Each structure stands twice: as C-alpha cells, then as structure tokens.
Design a protein that fits this description.
This is part of a larger assembly, with two copies of chain A.
Chain A lengths: L7 H26 L10 H9 L1
Subunit structure (chain A): Heteromer of multiple flagellin subunits including FlaA, FlaB, FlaC, FlaD and FlaE.
Protein name (chain A): Flagellin D
Subcellular location (chain A): Secreted; Bacterial flagellum
C-alpha cells in the first residue's frame, strides 16, 4: 500500500546512515590519534593492560 | 671529577639526538595524519547538502 503519514524506507535508511556515520567518526578518531584504544568503549580490558604497559 | 661530573650532566641535561630526531619525525607524521583526517571531517556536514536541506 502507498501511504504518506509514514515512510518505512526513510526510517531504515536514516538508521543505517547514523550507524555508518558512527563508524566514520570512530574510525577517523583512530587515525588522527594514532591509537585504536581511545576510550573504554573500544576495549575496557585492552585499555587496562595497555595503560599498565 | 670534572669529566665524571660533565658526563652526569650529559645523561641528565644534554639531548639524545637519536631519540629526539625519531620523536620529531613521529610528531610530524601525526601532524600530517591529523591534518588529513581534519579535511575528511570538514566534508562530514557537506553530506547534509545531498539531503536537499
């Protein structure tokens, strides 16, 4: 059916665009800093050992 | 005592050119890596124009 109140395609494309944008932001932070461990979210365990090293 | 005092002053005060030149080159590469990431980031909001907004 064709409806104008809602657009399922619009919601899905937006969601995958926000996920892709999040991937772009986390990646670009990695190159600029040079570290793949910039916050506990990336790796909580890996951050702890790395700081100990 | 003059030579041994000077050598101690060397280990503390004088710079290690081998280690410092490496630290300078590393810093430059991160300066260029951050600059490149910045340019890629400046076009992040430009995608909003593709939304015809």
């Amino acid at each position: 059916a064709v409806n104008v109140n809602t657009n399922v395609a619009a919601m899905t494309a937006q969601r995958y665009l926000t996920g892709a944008t999040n991937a772009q932001q986390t990646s670009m932070e990695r190159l600029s800093s040079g570290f793949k461990i910039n916050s506990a979210k990336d790796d909580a365990a890996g951050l702890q050992i790395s700081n100990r090293l | 005592i003059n030579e041994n005092v000077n050598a101690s002053k060397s280990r503390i005060k004088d710079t290690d050119f081998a280690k410092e030149t490496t630290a300078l080159t590393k810093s430059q590469i991160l300066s260029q890596a951050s600059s490149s990431v910045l340019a890629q980031a400046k076009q992040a909001p430009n995608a909003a124009l593709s939304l015809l907004g």
